[PDB]
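Hi W.,

Here's what went into the run:
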Amino acid sequence: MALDANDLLPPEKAFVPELAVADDGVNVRFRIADGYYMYQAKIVGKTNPADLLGQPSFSKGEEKEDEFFGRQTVYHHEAQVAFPYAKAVGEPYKLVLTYQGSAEAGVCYPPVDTEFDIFGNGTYHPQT
Amino acid sequence: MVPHTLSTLKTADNRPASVYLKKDKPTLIKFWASWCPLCLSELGQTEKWAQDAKFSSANLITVASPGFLHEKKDGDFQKWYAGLNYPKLPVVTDNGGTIAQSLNISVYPSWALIGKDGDVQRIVKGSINEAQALALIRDPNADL
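Here's what came out:
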């Protein structure tokens, strides 16, 4: 709240996962702290009952040059992924999210994966 | 405490962690990620630093939890190192994250300083440096 930037704050609080459940699909908008960046090529996100999802619709950020990955699309603050269902059924679905990235300070955090159960609540947050 | 469990920690070489957990010497557990750019470059540094005469005063080891934090599952991680370089890397396999969970490891690298009595004396989340190492040698309370 008073900062949310740099490497002074741990990843557990450096990310604000705002879950927006709509009628068309599920939109996950996690606010990334100013200093951390995630790899769009390693971001895992999917929600469906029995694998009835079309495809993970990313918003696409900017390309980041690298020494090992060469260059990939990364998110440094902006993060929005929409999950459109391929089946229109009022069934309960699970949400699998995996946050993988690194910090510009030379810190490499593991892909903290959190699975959520969509039973109907609107907003969702990890119970850590 | 859990001394028996700590001694059950097998490395990617299939050897017990006891090889670096004896003689009443301080231990330094460093966590890392397999498929990470930053960790990849640091891997060479870990070996280089571990070979330093000054760093030979502490048992510096690299531990990873197969299957934990979405990392490589058990049976895949040890196989990964088997095809890697550096035939002298003290890589330990923490099945389930017995060490990672107990220290609430959410970000790498993680530097766990174990005292000569076999207890966690210090825990740092991030990266260390030479000046910091010297400070630790002077006072173990000199965090960050």
